[PDB]
Amino acid sequence: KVFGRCELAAAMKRHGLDNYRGYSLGNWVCAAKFESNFNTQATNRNTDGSTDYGILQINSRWWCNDGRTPGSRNLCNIPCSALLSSDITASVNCAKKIVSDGNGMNAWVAWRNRCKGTDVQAWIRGCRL
Ligand code: NA
């Protein structure tokens, strides 16, 4: 599913991401824009042979099982395919564990490079939330 910006903002809010670990909703929407362009089916292979899955490009190296990432963990206890669903519950639940890991949203290199320090509120501008 390709979410609309405010559609994804509303879904993330419903799932308790708004100000989760002190990260306002605009940070999460900004991360999703540059990770996946709001596409739940987004997949990208990493140089280390791990894969990133879904709206927030959650990595098989640590967080989900894809069966093809040697030496990896599955700390969200989910198949990586669950992260591609039109239903973002599994992506949100797993994002909560990642952002709690100690480095906050720096875990998302695209958030650090493209969203951190910017006017992230612009990403929820006009949305009925
Ligand atoms: Na894994």
Q: How far is the CA of 39 from the centre of ligand 1 (A)?
A: 21
Q: How many domains does the chain have?
A: 1
State the burial class of residue 117 (Cβ atoms within 10 Å of its Cβ: 0-12, 13-18, 19+). exposed
Determined by: X-ray
Is residue 48 annotated as involved in ligand binding? no
Q: Which residues are catalytic?
A: 35, 52
Handedness of CA 120, 98, 38, 51 (dihedral sign): positive
Residue 66, token pair as written in the block: 């894809």
Nearest residue to 104 (alpha-carbon basis) of 118, 116, 120: 116
Q: How far is the CA of 76 from the centre of ligand 1 (A)?
A: 9
User: For the domain that residue 52 is a member of, what is the CATH number?
Assistant: 1.10.530.10
Nearest residue to 31 (alpha-carbon basis) of 97, 125, 120: 120
Q: Under DSSP, is residue 87 helix (H, G, I), strand (E, B) or coil? A: coil
**Is 129 inside any structural domain?**
no
Q: How far is the CA of 103 from the centre of ligand 1 (A)?
A: 20
Q: What are phi and psi of 28, to 5 degrees?
A: -70, -45
**Is 104 inside any structural domain?**
yes
Nearest-10 crossing angle of helices 25-36, 5-14: 130
Q: Give dist(CA 56, CA 52) in Å, integer.
A: 8
Output DSSP code: residue 44: E
The alpha helices in 1-129, defined as continuous H runs, are 5-14, 25-36, 89-99, 109-114
